[PDB]
């Protein structure tokens, strides 16, 4: 969050707060707007989960590089906490039903549809007011449970055009979600770009088939590989590469 507090020559920031409908989760949303002028068709915009951790890792070198191409509006959707994650809240908000199948691991799970309604009908309309946004260039990113949320949203949403799903293979219901992803009807998901991002290191077998089937179904689906990265470097790589990609790299 602190780069928002400090300011950047490349971008200006504001922060807004929202509550879940059940009243028990409390969101802190940072909007970073480029200080360079938007193209006439508007800024691309990337909505990013785990927003507190994204803001802690955002730095001027990335903002400078984004500004070499078409810098996006960045919406970091975080929590009212002084830690980089709200582990309880994200396990609820980011996960679909399937994540708790045949287990007693479940911090409760299964809040993805209510969090998507909050995001698409409450947070996004508010933070886009007053900005020239290129709606065809609206993207969503998340890692780990956040990567499951992105797959869940690629299946159900009409709001975003680009979906960057990082490390979803870490989730228990990864295969169940891939099974739904490759079951979609031909052509209906053609306007929803899907970018699967994996590092960590099979998983790759699953992804190549996934890409093959989705292509056959008319989907622009791609794989970003960050070989042998640990969790921290992969969190960083995938969010920064998603920003760079949506800026036009
Ligand atoms: P992710 O939300 O985070 C890893 C970096 C530990 O993990 C879930 C899938 C267990």
Which domains are seen in the chain, by residue range? 1-249 (3.40.50.1820)
3-state secondary structure of 66: helix
Q: Whose CA is nearest to atom 1 of ligand 1?
A: 144
- DSSP per-residue codes, 81-134: SSSS--HHHHHHHT--GGGGTT-S-------HHHHHHHIIIIIHHHHTTTS-EE
Q: Which of 54, 171, 203 to mutate to test the pocket of ligand 1 (most atoms within 8 A of CB)?
A: 171
- The three-class DSSP label of residue 224 is strand
**Could you identify the atom of ligand 1 that is nearest to the CA of residue 231?**
5
3-state secondary structure at position 76: strand
Locate 40 and state its tokens. 């006439």
The technique by which this structure was obtained is X-ray
Exposed / middle / buried, residue 67 (Cβ in 10 Å: 0-12, 13-18, 19+): middle
Q: What is the resolution of this structure in A?
A: 1.4
What six digits make up the tokens of 126? Answer: 């508010």
Q: How far apart are CA 92 and CA 18, in angstroms?
A: 16
Cα–Cα separations (whole angstroms), residue 249 to 105, 137, 153, 201: 40, 14, 24, 25
Q: Are 172 and 107 in contact (CB under 8 A)?
A: no
- Taking only Cα atoms into account, the Rg of the chain, rounded to an integer number of angstroms, comes to 17
As given in the structure block, the two tokens for residue 223 are: 């794989």
Q: Which residues pair with 77 in a beta bridge?
A: 29
Nearest to 207 by CA among 157, 167, 173, 245: 167
All residues at 6 or more sequence positions from 86 whose CB lies less than 8 Å from its CB, including other chains:
25, 52, 78, 79
Q: How many residues does the chain have?
A: 249
Ligand 1, residues 144, 198, 229: which to mutate, most atoms within 8 A of Cβ? 144
């Amino acid at each position: 969050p602190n780069i928002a507090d400090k300011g950047s020559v490349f971008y200006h920031f504001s922060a807004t707060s929202f509550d879940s409908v059940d009243g028990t989760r409390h969101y802190r949303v940072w909007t970073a707007v480029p200080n360079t002028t938007a193209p006439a068709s508007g800024y691309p915009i990337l909505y990013m989960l785990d927003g507190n951790a994204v803001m802690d890792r955002l730095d001027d070198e990335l903002l400078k590089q984004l500004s070499e191409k078409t810098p996006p509006v960045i919406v970091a959707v975080g929590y009212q906490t002084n830690l980089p994650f709200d582990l309880n809240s994200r396990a609820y908000d980011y996960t679909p039903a399937a994540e708790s199948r045949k287990t007693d691991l479940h911090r409760k799970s299964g809040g993805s549809n209510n969090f998507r309604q909050l995001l698409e009908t409450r947070i996004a309309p508010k933070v886009e007011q007053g900005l020239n946004i290129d709606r065809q260039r609206r993207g969503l990113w998340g890692h780990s449970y956040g990567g499951l949320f992105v797959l869940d949203s690629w299946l159900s949403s009409s709001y975003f055009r680009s979906y960057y799903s990082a490390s979803p293979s870490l989730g228990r219901g990864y295969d169940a979600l891939l099974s739904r992803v490759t079951a979609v009807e031909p052509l209906q998901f053609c306007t929803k770009h899907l970018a699967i991002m994996e590092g960590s290191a099979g998983v790759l077998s699953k992804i190549h088939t996934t890409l093959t089937i989705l292509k056959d179904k008319g989907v622009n689906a791609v794989f970003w590989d960050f070989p042998n990265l640990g969790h921290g470097p992969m969190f960083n790589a995938s969010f920064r590469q998603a920003l760079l990609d949506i800026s036009g790299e």
